[PDB]
Swiss-Prot record, chain F:
Organism of this sequence: Chlamydia trachomatis serovar D (strain ATCC VR-885 / DSM 19411 / UW-3/Cx)
HAMAP family: ubiX_pad (MF_01984)
GO MF assignments: carboxy-lyase activity; flavin prenyltransferase activity
Pfam families: Flavoprotein (PF02441)
SUPFAM superfamilies, A to Z: Homo-oligomeric flavin-containing Cys decarboxylases, HFCD (SSF52507)
Identification of the protein by name: Flavin prenyltransferase UbiX
Amino acid sequence: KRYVVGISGASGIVLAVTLVSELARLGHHIDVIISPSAQKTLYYELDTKSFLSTIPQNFHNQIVLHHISSIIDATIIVPCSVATVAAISCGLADNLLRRVADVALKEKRPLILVPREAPLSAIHLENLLKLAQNGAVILPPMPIWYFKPQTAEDIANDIVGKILAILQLDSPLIK
Amino acid sequence: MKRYVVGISGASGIVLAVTLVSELARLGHHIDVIISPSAQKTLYYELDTKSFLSTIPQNFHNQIVLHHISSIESSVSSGSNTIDATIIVPCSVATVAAISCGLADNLLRRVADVALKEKRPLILVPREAPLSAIHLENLLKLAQNGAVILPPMPIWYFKPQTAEDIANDIVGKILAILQLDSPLIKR
Amino acid sequence: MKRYVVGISGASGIVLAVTLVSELARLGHHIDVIISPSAQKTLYYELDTKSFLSTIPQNFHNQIVLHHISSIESSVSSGSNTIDATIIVPCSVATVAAISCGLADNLLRRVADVALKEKRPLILVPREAPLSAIHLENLLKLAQNGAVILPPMPIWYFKPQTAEDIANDIVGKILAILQLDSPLIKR
Amino acid sequence: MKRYVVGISGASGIVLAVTLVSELARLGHHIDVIISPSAQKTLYYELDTKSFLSTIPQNFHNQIVLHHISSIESSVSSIDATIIVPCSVATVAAISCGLADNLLRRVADVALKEKRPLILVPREAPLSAIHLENLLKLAQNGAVILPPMPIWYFKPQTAEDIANDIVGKILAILQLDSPLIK
Amino acid sequence: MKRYVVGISGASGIVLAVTLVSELARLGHHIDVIISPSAQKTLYYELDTKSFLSTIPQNFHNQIVLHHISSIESSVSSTIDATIIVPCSVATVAAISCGLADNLLRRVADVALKEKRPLILVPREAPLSAIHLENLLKLAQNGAVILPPMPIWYFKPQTAEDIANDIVGKILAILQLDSPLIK
Amino acid sequence: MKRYVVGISGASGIVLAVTLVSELARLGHHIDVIISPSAQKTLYYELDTKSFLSTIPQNFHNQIVLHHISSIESSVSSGSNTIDATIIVPCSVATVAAISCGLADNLLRRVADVALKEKRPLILVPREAPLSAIHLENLLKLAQNGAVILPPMPIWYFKPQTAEDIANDIVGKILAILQLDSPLIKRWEN
Amino acid sequence: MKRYVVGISGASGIVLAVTLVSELARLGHHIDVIISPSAQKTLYYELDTKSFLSTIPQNFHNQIVLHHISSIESSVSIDATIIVPCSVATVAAISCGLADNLLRRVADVALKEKRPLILVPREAPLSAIHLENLLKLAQNGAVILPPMPIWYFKPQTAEDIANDIVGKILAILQLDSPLIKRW
Amino acid sequence: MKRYVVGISGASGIVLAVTLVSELARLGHHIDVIISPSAQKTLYYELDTKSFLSTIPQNFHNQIVLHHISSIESSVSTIDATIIVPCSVATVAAISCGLADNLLRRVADVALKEKRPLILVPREAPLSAIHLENLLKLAQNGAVILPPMPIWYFKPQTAEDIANDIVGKILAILQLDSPLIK
Amino acid sequence: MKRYVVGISGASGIVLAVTLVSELARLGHHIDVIISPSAQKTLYYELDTKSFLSTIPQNFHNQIVLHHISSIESSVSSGSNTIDATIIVPCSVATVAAISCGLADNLLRRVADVALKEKRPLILVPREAPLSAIHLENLLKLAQNGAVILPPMPIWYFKPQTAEDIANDIVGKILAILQLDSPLIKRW
Ligand SMILES: Cc1cc2nc3c(=O)[nH]c(=O)nc-3n(C[C@H](O)[C@H](O)[C@H](O)COP(=O)(O)O)c2cc1C
Ligand SMILES: Cc1cc2nc3c(=O)[nH]c(=O)nc-3n(C[C@H](O)[C@H](O)[C@H](O)COP(=O)(O)O)c2cc1C
Ligand SMILES: Cc1cc2nc3c(=O)[nH]c(=O)nc-3n(C[C@H](O)[C@H](O)[C@H](O)COP(=O)(O)O)c2cc1C
Ligand SMILES: Cc1cc2nc3c(=O)[nH]c(=O)nc-3n(C[C@H](O)[C@H](O)[C@H](O)COP(=O)(O)O)c2cc1C
Ligand SMILES: Cc1cc2nc3c(=O)[nH]c(=O)nc-3n(C[C@H](O)[C@H](O)[C@H](O)COP(=O)(O)O)c2cc1C
Ligand SMILES: Cc1cc2nc3c(=O)[nH]c(=O)nc-3n(C[C@H](O)[C@H](O)[C@H](O)COP(=O)(O)O)c2cc1C
Ligand SMILES: Cc1cc2nc3c(=O)[nH]c(=O)nc-3n(C[C@H](O)[C@H](O)[C@H](O)COP(=O)(O)O)c2cc1C
Ligand SMILES: Cc1cc2nc3c(=O)[nH]c(=O)nc-3n(C[C@H](O)[C@H](O)[C@H](O)COP(=O)(O)O)c2cc1C
Ligand SMILES: Cc1cc2nc3c(=O)[nH]c(=O)nc-3n(C[C@H](O)[C@H](O)[C@H](O)COP(=O)(O)O)c2cc1C
Ligand SMILES: CC(C)=CCOP(=O)(O)O
Ligand SMILES: CC(C)=CCOP(=O)(O)O
Ligand SMILES: CC(C)=CCOP(=O)(O)O
Ligand SMILES: CC(C)=CCOP(=O)(O)O
Ligand SMILES: CC(C)=CCOP(=O)(O)O
Ligand SMILES: CC(C)=CCOP(=O)(O)O
Ligand SMILES: CC(C)=CCOP(=O)(O)O
Ligand SMILES: CC(C)=CCOP(=O)(O)O
Ligand SMILES: CC(C)=CCOP(=O)(O)O
C-alpha cells in the first residue's frame, strides 16, 4: 500500500519515526515530507540530523524523502503543528505538505492529523473542528494508560498503535 | 494556603490526578476532591486501588476533603466560597459535554460551572482520541467561555525515559498554568 | 378548575414554589408537583422540613399529586394529557441547561419538554447569580422556543417590608402571567 | 457472522427492536443489546413482559448479549453497525451533545467518533425546534436519521405488517438481504 | 363550525388525509382540499381510486370544496382556523420553508405562517437527510407544527387502520378538537 | 483607596445602589456616581426623596462625586483615568440594550463602554421580569464581552427576614465580586 | 370596550394613525396615544395641523389619552399595541430593546408580555440594516405590516388606499369594521 | 461644484473636520455641516473656540450650511458623499443599528440606503469587540471605514503635518485632487 | 524587571516601536525584539538607518535581545517563559491575518500565538486605512480571543505640537495598557 507521512514542526518526531519504521516493516511504501521546522525538532529530540538514520537500513528502498518546496491509501501528518493545522483548514495549499493534505480532503481520501499543542486555544480548536467536519481524522497523541505503560517508549508505541488501527492495518503495536 | 478543587472524571490517566493532588498538598494548599463513579472504576483498573487517598501520603490527608459526586450542597458547590483554581483531570468527553451545556447536575459538573460563572480559573484535561466534530465543538465553546483546554500531550522535548516522566511533565504544565513553582515544572 | 404542573428544581427560593402551589389550590385548581432530589435538600435547608406537603395547608392536599422524579411513565409525561400551564420554580441552571438541550430524561425535564413540543405555557423561574454566557445562551434558546423566562426579581416599587412580601409579590407575577386574579397580584 | 449493537431506548415501538434483534439473530449474526430502564418500562407497557429475552426464540439466545446500561467499562465501549431503536428524543439530545455518560449513549458516541454506521430510529410527535436541531446536528455528523414511518405503498394490513416493513428498511440500510425487505 | 384547509401532497400515506377530512366533516366543519398531481398518483397506487371524494361518504361532500393546485387566485389564497398538509413530501417541505408560494398548496401554507394561524405539516420521508432536517427546523422555528406520522404502539394497535386512526387522532388533538380518534 | 464608578439607571431597586455606595465609602474608597433622569424619578417613588445624597451619611460625602448624565467630557468618561470597577445598579434593560450595542451617548452608557474597552471590571445588575429573547440576547452579548451579569437575585439560603436583609445580601454578592472584605458578605456552610 | 396603545412615530403616513384611532374609538374602545416629536412635525407637514386631536371628531376625545414621549413612568409602562407609522429609527430601537422613551417602552412591554405588537414601518428602499431589524422583530412575535396599497380593491382616491390599509390593521386586531374588505 | 455632507461627531480630532471642510470649500464645493452637542464640547477643548465657523477662513462661509442636530426634517435628510469625521464609537453604534434618530445619524443612514458614499473616520482606542463588530457590519453595508492613522512614511514634523496627510487620504477617497494628497 | 516581547511588523510607524522599546528599557525592563524583513525596510525609509539598535540609547542594549524572524526554536517561542506582555507594533494586516488564522509559522506570528494560548497580554497596533471587511473580521476575531486591538489613534485632546508629541502620547497609551507607571503617560 502507499502512505504519505508528513512531519510538521511540532514536538514528538518519535511518533513519526515509529510509524514510518512500522509501516515499512509491514511491507508498505511511504512518502515522507519533512518541514524545515521538524528537521530541527529532529535534532533537538533524537540528536541526529538525518531522518533516515532512525529507520532500519533495510527499509530505505520503501521510503522516499520529499522536499517541502517542490511544485495513495492514506495521508498522516505526524506530529502536526498548529500552524500546519491552520494552513490546511484555510485551504492554504502553498507547500507540498499542505498540498498533499488538501488533495486528500479534495478527493475524500483518509487524512489523519496528529496535533500536538497544549493548551489548545479557541483559534486552534476552531481549525481542528473545521477539519473534522471536512473529514479529517483528528487524533491527538493521548497516552492510553490502561495498558500500564512503563517506559516513555511504551507510550509512543501505543499511540502509533492507534494510528495503525485507523489505517485498517494489523500490527503487534495495536493492543 | 491556596484552595483548589480537583474533579476526577472517568477518562484514562488518573495517575495525572494523583500526582497533581500530591504536589498541591506537598506545596501546602487545600484541595477539595470529587471523584465520579466512573473515575472510581478507572482508579481500580489503572492504579489497582479503590481508595483515592491510598495513593497520596497520609501526612497530607488533613489538606484534602473528598466530596461525594451527589453532594451538590457541599461548600464547594457555592460561588460564595473562594477557590483559587478548579481542575478537571482527567476529563472525559461526557463531562466536557455536560460542562459545555451547563448541565451542572452533579457536584463535579457543578464545580466547573461555578468556576465559569465566577470567572475563576478552570483547567480541563480532556482525554479522548480521535476527537470527533461533536467533541471538538464542545471544547471550542468551553475555550471561548474561558476554560483552559489542556489535553495530556507528552512533552517530548524533555526526553522522558519512563512513563512517570511523561505524567510528571504533563502535571508540571498544569502547575505552570496555576502559576505555582514546583520541581515538576521543566523548561 | 385548571390543571397545573409545578416542577421544583434545586435552586434557592423553594418558598416561591410553596406559596404558588398554596395559592393555586386556594383558588380551586389541581397541581401536579414534581420535586427533584436537590430541591428536597433545599426544602430542608431553607424551610427546615423534609415534607413539601407539610408546608401546604392540609385541606389543600387532596388537590395536589406528588410525582416521583423518575416516573417518566406518568400521565403528565405524555403530551395527550392536557395541562393548562407548567411552572418550574425555582429552576436551577442545570435544569435550564437540560430543558434547553432536549434532555428530557427525568419527569421534571420531561414535563417542560412536553409543554414546549405541544406549545403549552412553560414558565421557568431561574435563580442563579451571576449568569454566565453559558447560562444566558440556554435561557435565550428557551425564550426563542416560547418559554417564559421569569427570574425572581424583587419588586421594590411595591415597597416590601419583609422577606415574605418580596416572595408574595414575586408569586404575584407568576399568577399574573397565568391569568388568574389573586390578592397576591399588585398593579 | 457480523456483530451489531442494538440500544433500546425508552420510546414507543419496542416491537421494532424485537423484530430487528430477532431477524439479525435468524441470519446468524451476533447482537450486543443494551436496554435502558425507561425501555424496560416500555417493554412492559407495550408487550406485557418483563423479560426482553422472552421475546426472541429461545434458540437464538446464544447469539445475544445483554449489557447493563451502567457498564461504561464494558466491551463495546472501546462493531458492524449500531442501531438505537426505538430512540427517545432525550437520548437523541444526549448523543447530539456528546453526553456519553451511560452505555447506550456511549456506544453511539463511539460509532460517531470511529465513522462506523449509526442508525437512529427517533420516535416523537410533534418534533419541536429543539428536537429538530439535535436531529440535524446528528445527520450532519453522519448518523442515519430513520424515524419509524409506515410505508403504506406496500399496502399493509396488520400492525405487524407496518412494523415489519419499517424493520425491513433498517435491514436494507445494513445491506443485508431479508424477507422483511420489499 | 370551523374552517380547515387540507393540502394533500404526494408522500405515501394518503389514507391519513382521507381519515382526517372524513372526521372533520363528521364533526361538522368545512374543509377546503387541495390535491397535488403527485398526491393524485399516490391516491391511485395506495387507495386504488382516481377520485378523492369517492373515499369520503357522500353526505359530507357539501362540506368539502376541491381547489385546483394552480388556482392561486382562490379565496383560500388570501380566516381559516387551521391548515394541514398531509401527507407532506420533503419537496413541499422545502418549498414552504423557502417561501416559494407558487402554487395553491404552497400558498395556503405561506398564508398560515404570514397570518400566524395554525399550520400542521405531516412530513413522511425516511431516512431524513441534513438538507431536509434543516428545512423542518426552519419551519418549526417559524411556528409550523411538525407532526410526522409516528405510530403509537402503546395504544397496542392490531391493524394498519388502527395505526392510521391513532396518527390522525394526534393531528386532531393538535387541532384542539374532541374526536374519538384521540386516545 | 480604590476608585469606583456607580451608574444608577432607572430600574426598580435603587436601595441596592444606596447600600452599595454607602459601603464602598465606609471601606475608605472613592465613588463617582451617575444618576439617570429615570433613576432620579425612581429614587422619589422608592425612597421618597429627590436627593440621592440624603440617603448616605454626610460623613461620606467628601468621598463621592455626582456626575450629570450628559457630562461625557467628565474625567470618568476617559480611559486614561484608571478606575478599579464600574457597577451599573440597578440596570434597566434599556441601558443593557445601549451598552450591548456600544451606544455610548451619555455618561452612564459611556462609563460602561470604557470599562469594556479597557478590560476593567463591569458589574451590571439588570432588573426586569419576564426577560424576552431580545433582552436575553443583549445580556448574552455583554457576558461574552466580559461584563458580569449579576441580576438582583434573592439569596434565600441565608434565611432573610426583612426586605433590607434581601438587599444587603445582594449588595454583599456585589462586594464579593469586587473582592472587597465587608460584613455585608455572607457565605455558604453545610 | 378594549384598550389599545397607538404609538405614532415620525415616518410618512400619519393619516394612517388618524384613521385607525378614529375608528377604534368609533367602535367603543379606549386608545392611549403617544406621539413622538418627529411625528408631530410630520403631522404638520402632511395634515397641516400641530394638534392630533384636531383631526379626530370631538365626541371621541374622552376615549383618548395622550401621553408624553418621555413619560416613561406611565401606567402604560394591554390588548394590542400598534406603532403607526413606524420609522426605521423606531424599528431599530425596538429591535435592540432600546426602551428609553415611552413609545419604545410600550413596544418592549408588548413583546415581553407576549401581547400583540403591530408595526407599520414605512421606508423605501429598505437597506440590509433595516431588513435585519425587521426580521429580528418578526422572529420575536411582532406583526410586520408595511403600508402596502391593496390594489385589487380598485381604489379611486388616496383616502381609499389609506382606509384599506387601516382595514388590514383592523383585520389583524380581529375587530369587525366597515373599513375591512375581503376578497 | 460637488455637494458633500460632513457630520461632526464627538470623538477626538475635530481638527480633521476643520481642515477637511475648509479644503473642500477651497476647491469650490458645497458642504452641509452637522455638529453634535458632544462635538461642540470637543471643539472647545481641542481648538479653544466655541464657534466652528471661526476655524474656517471667513471667505468660504457662503459654501457652508450648518444644520441643527435635531433638524431631521431637512433636504439633506443628491449628495456626492457623506463623511462623519471625527466619528465616535457611539455614532458608529447608532449607524450600525440603523438608529437614525438625529440628523447626523440620519444622513449616514440615507447614504447607506441610497448606496451613496459614506466615509466614517472612527476614533477610539482600544477598539473592543463590540466596536469592531459594528465597524465590520458597516463595512459589509458599503461604508468606507477610515480610522485616522498617521502616515509616517511622509516624515511628518509637526502635529499639523499628520492631520493634513490624514485629510489627504480622505480627499483621495473622495477622488479629489488636492495639495493635501501626496 | 518585567519581560516584554515586541514584534515589529512591516507597517508604517516603526517610530512607535522605537519609543516603546527604549521607554520599557529605561524603566528597567527586559525586551526581546523580533523585526520582520519588511519592518527592517520601513526602518530605513522612516528612521534613516537599518540598525534598529542605533535608535536606542546604548546604555539600554544589555536589556534588549534581537531574535531573527525565522528562529521558531527560540525561547520566546514556548509557553515556558512567563512573558509579561507581547506587543506587535506596528502590525501589518498580513500579520493580523496570520495570527487570527493561527498561522504561526515564523517567530513573530508564533510569539503572538503563544500569548493567546497562555492567556497573557497580546497588544496589537494595526495600521491600515481604510479597513476592509476582511480585515475588520480578523481584528474582531482576535479581540474575541483576548487580544487588545490598539490602533495608533492620535490623542488630540492632549493638544500635541510636534509629530513626536503624537507618537509619544500613543506610546503612552500602550504603556497605560501595560499598567506601567511612566512619565510618557498623560491622563485626561
Ligand atoms: C523543539 C520544538 C518543539 C515544538 N513543538 C511544537 C508543538 O508541540 N506544537 C506546535 O504547534 N508547534 C511546535 N513547535 C513550533 C512549530 O514548529 C512552528 O509552529 C512551525 O512554524 C510549524 O511549522 P511546520 O508545521 O511547517 O513545521 C515546536 C518547535 C520546536 C523548535
Ligand atoms: C441550599 C442550596 C441552594 C442552591 N441554590 C442554587 C441556585 O440558586 N442556582 C443553581 O443553579 N443551583 C443551586 N443549587 C445547586 C443545584 O441544586 C444543583 O445544581 C442541582 O444538581 C440541580 O439539580 P435539579 O435542577 O435537578 O434540582 C443549590 C443547592 C443547595 C443545596
Ligand atoms: C410507555 C411509554 C412510552 C414512551 N414513548 C416515548 C416516545 O415515543 N418518545 C419519547 O421521547 N419519550 C417516550 N417516553 C419517555 C421516555 O422514555 C423518557 O423521556 C426517558 O427518560 C428516555 O430515556 P431513555 O432514552 O434512556 O430510554 C415514553 C415513556 C413510556 C413509559
Ligand atoms: C478504563 C476506562 C477508561 C476510560 N477512558 C475514557 C477516556 O479516556 N475518555 C472518555 O471520554 N471516556 C473514557 N471512559 C468512559 C467514561 O468513563 C464514560 O464516558 C463515563 O460515563 C464518563 O463519566 P464521568 O466523566 O463523570 O466519569 C473510560 C472508561 C473506562 C472503564
Ligand atoms: C407512490 C409514491 C409515494 C411517494 N412517497 C413519497 C414520500 O413518502 N416522501 C417523499 O418525500 N416523496 C414521496 N414521493 C415523491 C414525491 O411525489 C415527489 O417529491 C413529488 O414531486 C412531490 O410533489 P408534491 O409534494 O407537490 O405532491 C412519492 C411518490 C410516489 C409515486
Ligand atoms: C418606578 C419605576 C420602576 C421601573 N422599573 C424598571 C425595571 O425594573 N426594569 C426596567 O427595565 N425598567 C424599569 N423602569 C423603566 C426604565 O427606567 C425605562 O426603561 C428608562 O427609560 C430606562 O432609562 P435609564 O436606564 O437610562 O435610567 C421603571 C420605571 C419606573 C418609573
Ligand atoms: C474632549 C473629548 C474627547 C472625546 N474623544 C472621544 C473619542 O476619541 N472616541 C469616542 O468614542 N468618544 C470620545 N468622546 C466622548 C463622546 O463624545 C461621547 O461618547 C458622545 O456621547 C458621543 O456623541 P456623538 O458621537 O453623537 O457626538 C470624547 C469626549 C470629549 C469631551
Ligand atoms: C415629513 C417627514 C416625513 C418623514 N418620513 C419618514 C419615513 O417615511 N421613514 C423614515 O424612516 N423616516 C421618516 N422621517 C424622519 C424620521 O422622523 C426620523 O428618522 C426621526 O429621527 C425618527 O423619529 P421617531 O421615529 O422616534 O419619531 C420623516 C420626517 C419628516 C419631517
Ligand atoms: C514602506 C512600506 C510601508 C508599508 N506600510 C504598511 C502599512 O502601513 N500597513 C500595512 O498593513 N502594510 C504595510 N506595508 C506592507 C506590509 O509590510 C506587507 O503586507 C508585509 O509583507 C507584511 O509582512 P510583515 O507585516 O510581517 O512585515 C508596507 C510596506 C512597505 C514597503
Ligand atoms: C450549595 C449552594 C448554596 C449553592 C448556591 O450558591 P450560588 O449562589 O448558586 O453560587
Ligand atoms: C409516558 C410517555 C413515554 C409518553 C409519551 O407521549 P407523547 O410522546 O407526548 O405523545
Ligand atoms: C471502556 C473504555 C476502555 C473506554 C475507553 O475507550 P476510548 O479510547 O474512549 O475509545
Ligand atoms: C389571492 C390574493 C388576493 C392574495 C392576496 O392576499 P394578501 O393581502 O396577500 O393576504
Ligand atoms: C472624555 C474623553 C477624553 C474620552 C476619551 O478618552 P479615551 O479614548 O477613552 O481614552
Ligand atoms: C414603570 C414600571 C412599573 C415598569 C415595570 O417593569 P416590570 O414589568 O415590572 O419589570
Ligand atoms: C424629511 C423627509 C422627506 C424624510 C423622508 O425621506 P425618505 O423617503 O425616507 O428618503
Ligand atoms: C519552541 C518550542 C519548544 C515550542 C513548543 O512549546 P509549547 O509547549 O508548544 O508551548
Ligand atoms: C509597499 C508600500 C509602500 C505599502 C504602503 O501602503 P499601505 O499603507 O500598506 O496601503
